[PDB]
Amino acid sequence: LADVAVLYSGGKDSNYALYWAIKNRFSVKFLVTMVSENEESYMYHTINANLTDLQARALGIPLVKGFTQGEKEKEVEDLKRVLSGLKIQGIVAGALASKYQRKRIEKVAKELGLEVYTPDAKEYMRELLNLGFKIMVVGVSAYGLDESWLGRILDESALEELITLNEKYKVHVAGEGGEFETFVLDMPLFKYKIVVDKAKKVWEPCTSSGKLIIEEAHLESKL
Amino acid sequence: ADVAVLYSGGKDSNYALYWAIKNRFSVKFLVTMVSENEESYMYHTINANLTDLQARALGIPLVKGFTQGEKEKEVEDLKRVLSGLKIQGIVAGALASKYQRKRIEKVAKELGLEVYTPDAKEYMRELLNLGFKIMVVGVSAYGLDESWLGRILDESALEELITLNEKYKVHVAGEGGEFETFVLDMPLFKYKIVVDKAKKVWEPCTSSGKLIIEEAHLESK
Numbered sequence: 001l002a003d004v005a006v007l008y009s010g011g012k013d014s015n016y017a018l019y020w021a022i023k024n025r026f027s028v029k030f031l032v033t034m035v036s037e038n039e040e041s042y043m044y045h046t047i048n049a050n051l052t053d054l055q056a057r058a059l060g061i062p063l064v065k066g067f068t069q070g071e072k073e074k075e076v077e078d079l080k081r082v083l084s085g086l087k088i089q090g091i092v093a094g095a096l097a098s099k100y101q102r103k104r105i106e107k108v109a110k111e112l113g114l115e116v117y118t119p120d121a122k123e124y125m126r127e128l129l130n131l132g133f134k135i136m137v138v139g140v141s142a143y144g145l146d147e148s149w150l151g152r153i154l155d156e157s158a159l160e161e162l163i164t165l166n167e168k169y170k171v172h173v174a175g176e177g178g179e180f181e182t183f184v185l186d187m188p189l190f191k192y193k194i195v196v197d198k199a200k201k202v203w204e205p206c207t208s209s210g211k212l213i214i215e216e217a218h219l220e221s222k223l
Numbered sequence: 224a225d226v227a228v229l230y231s232g233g234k235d236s237n238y239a240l241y242w243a244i245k246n247r248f249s250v251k252f253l254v255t256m257v258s259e260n261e262e263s264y265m266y267h268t269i270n271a272n273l274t275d276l277q278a279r280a281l282g283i284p285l286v287k288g289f290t291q292g293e294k295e296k297e298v299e300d301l302k303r304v305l306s307g308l309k310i311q312g313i314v315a316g317a318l319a320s321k322y323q324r325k326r327i328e329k330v331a332k333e334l335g336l337e338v339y340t341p342d343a344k345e346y347m348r349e350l351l352n353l354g355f356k357i358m359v360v361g362v363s364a365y366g367l368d369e370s371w372l373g374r375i376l377d378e379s380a381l382e383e384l385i386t387l388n389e390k391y392k393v394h395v396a397g398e399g400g401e402f403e404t405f406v407l408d409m410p411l412f413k414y415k416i417v418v419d420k421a422k423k424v425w426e427p428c429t430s431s432g433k434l435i436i437e438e439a440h441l442e443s444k
C-alpha cells in the first residue's frame with residue numbers, strides 16, 4: 001500500500017507531490033505523464049510534457065508516458081488504462097489541481113481500487129524555496145507578468161515581486177489562478193541538475209501571453 | 224497474453240512489436256532503457272530518447288527506465304523497470320546478441336516473466352516488404368563509411384550491404400553492433416516520422432559514427 005504512482009507534469013506542484021511522497025516514505029514506483037495531442041486539454045498540461053524525460057532521468061525513477069487525443073472525458077479513461085497496467089496501490093498528484101481534475105482523478109482511482117493522496121501561497125512558495133527548488137517560469141498569462149518573466153528563476157526577490165503584483169493586480173502568488181506556468185530544473189531529490197543550453201520564448205500580443213520553449217538542455221553532476 | 228516489448232527504436236525492436244501484435248499478444252507497454260554508457264554491450268543508446276516519438280505514433284504507452292551503464296547494474300536496473308508492470312512476459316528482438324539474451328533471460332526468470340523472441344538477407348528483405356522505413360543512425364565496421372549515416376535502407380541499399388558482406392564480411396542485418404537503425408515508418412504507425420534536423424558525428428579514432436536526430440515531427444499517412 002506504499003507503492004504509488006505520481007502524476008507528473010514537470011512543474012513545481014508535481015515535484016512537490018513527489019517530494020512529499022518520498023519524504024512520507026512512500027514508494028514511488030513510477031512517474032506518469034500523459035501526452036495530450038489536444039492543446040486545450042482540460043485534464044492534462046502540455047507545457048514541457050516532453051521534458052519530463054529529463055527530470056525522470058535526473059531522478060532515476062521509471063517514467064510512464066501515456067498518449068491520448070485529449071478529448072473531454074475520453075482522457076480520464078486513457079489514464080485509467082495506463083494506471084491499471086501498473087503495480088501500484090495509490091496515486092499522488094499536486095494539491096493545486098481543480099475540482100474538475102480532482103473529481104475525475106478520484107473517479108478512476110476508485111474504479112481501480114487506488115488511494116488518492118493530494119498534499120497560503122506565500123508560505124507554500126517559501127517552503128519550496130527552502131526545500132531547494134529551482135523553479136523556472138515557462139509560461140505567463142496575466143496582467144503584470146510581462147515577457148521578461150519568461151525564463152526567470154523564482155527566488156526570494158522574484159517571490160517578493162509576485163507579492164507586489166498580487167497586491168496591485170491580484171496575481172496569485174503560486175499561480176493558483178493560472179497566472180504562470182513552471183518547470184523544475186533542480187531539487188534535492190534530483191541526482192543531477194537540468195541546465196538549459198538553448199531556448200526561445202514565443203509571445204502572443206493578442207492576449208499578452210507567452211511561453212519559454214526549452215529546445216536544448218543537459219544534466220550536470222551535483223557534488 | 225499481456226506483454227511489454229523492449230523497444231530501442233531500431234528495426235529489430237520494431238519487428239519484435241510487429242511480431243508480438245500479429246501473434247495475438249497484448250502489448251501493454253514499450254520499454255526503453257536509457258544508458259549513459261555510450262559503449263554498452265547491453266542496450267542501443269543512439270537516439271534512445273527518440274522512442275517517445277515512435278510510441279506517440281503507435282499509440283502505445285512507453286516506459287522509460289534509466290541506467291548509468293555499469294555492467295554490474297545491467298540486470299538490476301532493467302529488473303527495476305519491469306518488476307512494476309502487470310505483464311506476463313516480455314518480447315525482445317530476435318537478433319539480440321548472446322551477451323544480451325543471457326541478461327534478458329535472467330531478469331525474466333527473476334520476475335517470473337516469459338521471454339518471447341521472434342538468414343539475414345531474408346530477414347531484411349521481409350522488413351522492406353512489410354513496408355518498414357529504416358534509417359541508419361550508427362555504423363561501426365570496416366567498410367562502412369560516414370555516407371551511411373542518415374541513409375534510408377531500401378532494396379538498393381540492402382544489395383550494397385550484401386556486397387560489403389562479400390568484400391569485408393559486414394553483417395547484412397548489422398548484428399554485433401555493426402550498424403544501428405531508426406524506424407521512421409511502419410504499418411502499425413498511425414503517423415510517419417520525418418527528420419527535420421540531424422547531426423552526423425564521426426569518430427576517426429575507431430572509424431565509426433552516429434547520427435544524432437535533433438529535430439523531427441509526425442506527418443500524416
Ligand SMILES: Nc1ncnc2c1ncn2[C@@H]1O[C@H](COP(=O)(O)OP(=O)(O)OP(=O)(O)O)[C@@H](O)[C@H]1O
Pocket residue numbers: 006007008009010011012013014015017032033034035043044045046049092093094095096097098101181182
Ligand atoms: N500532463 C499531465 N500528466 C500527468 N499528470 C498531470 C498532468 N498535468 C497535471 N498533472 C497532475 O495534476 C496536477 C494538476 O495540474 P494542473 O493542471 O493544475 O497544473 P500544475 O499544478 O501547474 O502542474 P504542475 O504539478 O506541473 O505544477 C499536477 O499537480 C499533477 O500531479
Ligand SMILES: Nc1ncnc2c1ncn2[C@@H]1O[C@H](COP(=O)(O)OP(=O)(O)OP(=O)(O)O)[C@@H](O)[C@H]1O
Pocket residue numbers: 229230231232233234235236237239254255256257265266267268271314315316317318319320323397398399400402403404405
Ligand atoms: N535501449 C534499449 N532499451 C530496451 N531494449 C533494447 C535497447 N537496446 C536493445 N534492446 C533490445 O535488444 C535487442 C537488440 O538490440 P539491437 O541494437 O541489436 O537491435 P535494435 O536496436 O532493435 O535495432 P538496430 O540494431 O538496427 O538499431 C533489440 O531488438 C531490443 O529488443
